[PDB]
Structures are given as C-alpha cells and as structure tokens.
Amino acid sequence: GSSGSSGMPCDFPGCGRIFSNRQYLNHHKKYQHIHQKSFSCPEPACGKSFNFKKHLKEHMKLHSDTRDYICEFSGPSSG
Ligand SMILES: [Zn+2]
Ligand SMILES: [Zn+2]
Numbered sequence: 805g806s807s808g809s810s811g812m813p814c815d816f817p818g819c820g821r822i823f824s825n826r827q828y829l830n831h832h833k834k835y836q837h838i839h840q841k842s843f844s845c846p847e848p849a850c851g852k853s854f855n856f857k858k859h860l861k862e863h864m865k866l867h868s869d870t871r872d873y874i875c876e877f878s879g880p881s882s883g
C-alpha cells in the first residue's frame with residue numbers, strides 16, 4: 805500500500821463499484837445497499853450465507869474440523 809489508487813471502490817465484494825467523490829459512495833451504499841449488510845462463507849464450495857454475525861462464527865466451527873497446512877509440496881513457495 806505504498807500509494808493510493810484513483811476513485812473509491814465500494815465495500816461489497818460482488819458490487820465492485822467505484823466513485824471519485826466519497827459523498828457519492830456513501831449515498832450509493834445508503835441507496836443501493838440501503839438494505840442490511842450480510843455475511844458470506846469464505847468457502848467457495850460452501851457458498852453459505854448468514855444474516856447474523858453469531859451464525860457465521862458458529863458455522864465456521866464445523867469447517868474447523870478440517871485442518872490444513874499453509875505450506876505444501878505440490879506448490880513450493882519461492883521468493
Ligand atoms: Zn456498492
Ligand atoms: Zn461454510
């Protein structure tokens with residue numbers, strides 16, 4: 805994050821909107837995203853969603869069951 809970028813991107817991931825002036829952004833979120841924010845699962849295959857913060861947390865619990873290592877042979881990290 806050495807330097808910033810032009811325009812101001814939206815918060816929502818799917819949205820993918822950009823607005824030069826901030827005023828517009830806030831208005832866009834208050835208008836388009838007027839609705840209440842939501843929580844999505846960080847898993848692609850899961851594609852689950854929860855309208856409650858607690859729900860997401862508890863949901864993850866299950867996933868936890870499966871553990872993994874940041875490092876792997878298949879893809880040797882270099883640099
Ligand atoms: Zn947006
Ligand atoms: Zn999930």
